[PDB]
Design a binder for this molecule. Structure first.
Ligand SMILES: OC[C@H]1O[C@@H](O[C@H]2[C@H](O)[C@@H](O)[C@H](O)O[C@@H]2CO)[C@H](O)[C@@H](O)[C@H]1O
Ligand SMILES: OC[C@H]1O[C@@H](O[C@H]2[C@H](O)[C@@H](O)[C@H](O)O[C@@H]2CO)[C@H](O)[C@@H](O)[C@H]1O
Lengths: 132, 132
């Protein structure tokens, strides 16, 4: 999937990612981070994957290893359709704004003040990114 | 500058790139391409660089070498301010839509039907990209 690299996504800014979920999707993820074998914020939108149905699984990855999962059952997404999510953060917490207006919080586990990449994975295509 | 990679920018689609020119700019470029040491379309917006003032210099790069320059004196850009450009193409030609409504044409010198990256260089920051 699309990777947007060398971004300067700093404390207090807003990153919006828009796209279209594939018609026949198991899951897709948004992945934000600041170093090559790590992902500070992984947001996995699981229509159906593993033991999860219509569940968001959130995690982080440190040197290619997944950390502790968190889940949300707020799942305002439909296969084949557009979505948009916006992410902001402070030193302690990522704030993920879902398009139904629900907010998920996830810990800023590496204590980052800036990020330099975002990429999509899975059963969706990125159509736009905005950073300001 | 920001690089957007693993895009699928196909014949007939539209790629829009928006950003803000630095307050004190010499030049910035938009660079679209499909292989690692090449740039199919380089659009250099020169406020002042070399012998050029307020000139767009267009070129392509093949295996790290620049090809023949083309110029436009249509220069609807201001240092410190937002800009947006949209690019489309067919097998023969790139069509670059400037925000004053002027269109620049530049040859599709490698005969590409799709591109997989766009990156910004120079004295500007990318704020958004849309691909559909
Ligand atoms: O933690 C994010 C990570 O999850 C992996 O899937 C896990 C799954 O969540 C868990 O229930 C099961 O026991 O193990 C799976 C494999 O580790 C995904 O494979 C990975 O891509 C991330 O999404
Ligand atoms: O052709 C695009 C390429 O131009 C380089 O600058 C040229 C300049 O246009 C030319 O007038 C002068 O004689 O040579 C310069 C150096 O090759 C830029 O340096 C390069 O970044 C591209 O923008």
């Amino acid at each position: 999937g699309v990777e947007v690299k060398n971004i300067t996504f700093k404390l207090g800014m807003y990153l919006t990612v828009g796209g279209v979920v594939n018609s026949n999707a198991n899951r897709f993820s948004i992945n934000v981070g600041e170093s090559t074998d790590s992902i500070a914020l992984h947001i996995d939108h699981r229509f159906s994957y593993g033991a999860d149905q219509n569940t968001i699984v959130l995690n982080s990855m440190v040197d290619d290893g997944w950390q502790q999962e968190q889940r949300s059952k707020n799942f305002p997404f439909t296969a084949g359709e557009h979505f948009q999510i916006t992410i902001t953060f402070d030193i302690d917490t990522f704030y993920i704004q879902l398009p139904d207006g629900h907010k998920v919080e996830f810990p800023n586990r590496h204590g980052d003040e800036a990020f330099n990449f975002i990429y999509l994975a899975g059963d969706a295509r990125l159509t736009f990114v905005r950073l300001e």
